[PDB]
């Protein structure tokens, strides 16, 4: 159901109509839409809906009407209502306006997030006092968000734009653009899996620090690293095998078969659910210890709300909210508006995590202030 297949089916139908007119009253002809056979005078001739239409399965019983007069000349009017797409095109123009605005929005958001994650990664790497296991998994999370941003930008740039304005037939197949599109799609899916898996790894690591009795975390650090990079390969590689064997398209971006997309949505939603349960348990422990102190009546609820806003972008709790939404509800027009907020939250999640874990953090500010004090003492 691509544009190149549409041009190929139109060329095949044009060749079939040319062979029919060569092998063959109002003289039927090819008026670039449907092939007209020879028509008796003074009759409403009916043509079938031509098979190169992408919605031909729904309008297979439709007929195009055209009047043949008694003088052997074709009529001026032509009725093509029975082959028409029932969905109105002006709403599609509003949809294109929405898609263009949201795509410029997350392009600017990914650029700002990429710059901020570059700066945060350089700050974490440069200073030698901050070499902590906690900061190590923050470095891995920032690297995974950075690879996510780079992969999505490469996938967006390398994608081939449709060519309706060209009109004339062109070589749809590309020996370079399609391979780059497939490669960028595989890298993009692997980076999405790495993002959600490192969110899971950091949630399990904080659960292990809080709940467990005191067992050493130095020994099984490799298990966290192995889980973080192993899981994306674990569910991406059978997805690549299924997309190669069963349903192959010019790019792997279109989800024509939903069953191939369920094996992508299942280890992501499972990860989000486990992180949400760990989020509930960490908030329970934090509420108990924060209620134990009891400084003031407003202050403990205020600090709980502050820590909830602090901790929601860490574990992907907002991704829970978009989880129940079914495809039937997704078909509704409201989902188009909802996608903008969801993509906004997802795109700026990396920027918020970077800013909160670099600028907001007191220890990082202390280290940077001390380094700037040493630089000003060296200069003066």
């Amino acid at each position: 159901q691509t544009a190149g297949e549409l041009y190929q089916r139109w060329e095949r139908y044009r060749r079939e109509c040319q062979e029919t007119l060569a092998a063959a009253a109002c003289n039927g002809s090819f008026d670039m839409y449907v092939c007209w056979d020879y028509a008796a005078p003074n009759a409403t001739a009916r043509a079938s809906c031509p098979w190169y239409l992408p919605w031909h399965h729904h309008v297979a019983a439709g007929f195009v009407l055209r009047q043949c007069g008694s003088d052997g000349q074709w009529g001026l009017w032509r009725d093509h209502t029975q082959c028409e797409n029932p969905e109105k095109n002006e709403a599609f123009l509003d949809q294109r306006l929405i898609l263009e605005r949201l795509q410029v929005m997350y392009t600017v958001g990914y650029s700002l997030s990429l710059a901020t994650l570059l700066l945060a990664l350089l700050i974490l790497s440069l200073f030698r006092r901050l070499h902590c296991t906690r900061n190590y998994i923050h470095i891995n999370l920032f690297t995974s968000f950075m690879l996510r941003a780079a992969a999505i930008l490469s996938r967006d740039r390398l994608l081939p734009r449709p060519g309706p304005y060209l009109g004339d037939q062109a070589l749809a197949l590309w020996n370079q653009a399609l391979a780059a599109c497939r490669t960028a799609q595989i890298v993009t899916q692997y980076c999405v899996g790495a993002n959600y898996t490192w969110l899971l790894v950091e949630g399990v690591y904080l659960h292990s620090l809080l709940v467990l009795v005191g067992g050493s975390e130095e020994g099984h650090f490799r298990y966290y690293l192995l889980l973080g990079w192993g899981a994306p390969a674990l569910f991406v590689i059978p997805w690549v095998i299924v997309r190669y064997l069963y349903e192959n398209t010019q790019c792997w971006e279109r989800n024509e078969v939903k069953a191939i997309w369920w094996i992508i949505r299942t280890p992501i939603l499972m990860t989000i659910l486990i992180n949400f349960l760990i989020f509930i348990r960490i908030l329970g422990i934090l509420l108990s210890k924060l209620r134990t102190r009891q400084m003031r009546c407003r202050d403990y609820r205020l600090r709980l709300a502050r820590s909830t806003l602090f901790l929601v972008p860490l574990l992907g709790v907002h991704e829970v909210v978009f989880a129940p939404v079914t495809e039937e509800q997704a078909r509704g027009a409201l989902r188009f508006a909802k996608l903008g907020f969801e993509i906004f939250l997802s795109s700026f999640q990396g920027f918020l995590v970077s800013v909160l874990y670099c600028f907001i953090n007191k220890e990082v500010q202390s280290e940077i202030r001390r380094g700037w004090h040493h630089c000003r003492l060296r200069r003066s």
Binding site: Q1, W10, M32, P54, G163, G167, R265, A330
Partner: peptide, 30 residues
Amino acid sequence: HAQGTFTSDKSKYLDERAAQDFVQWLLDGG
């Protein structure tokens, strides 16, 4: 995953609008 569904919807929309513009031009003729 939201953004993959977004990209799939955009690709489907592009294919559909290319189909509608192609059918429109063919109806126009010339």
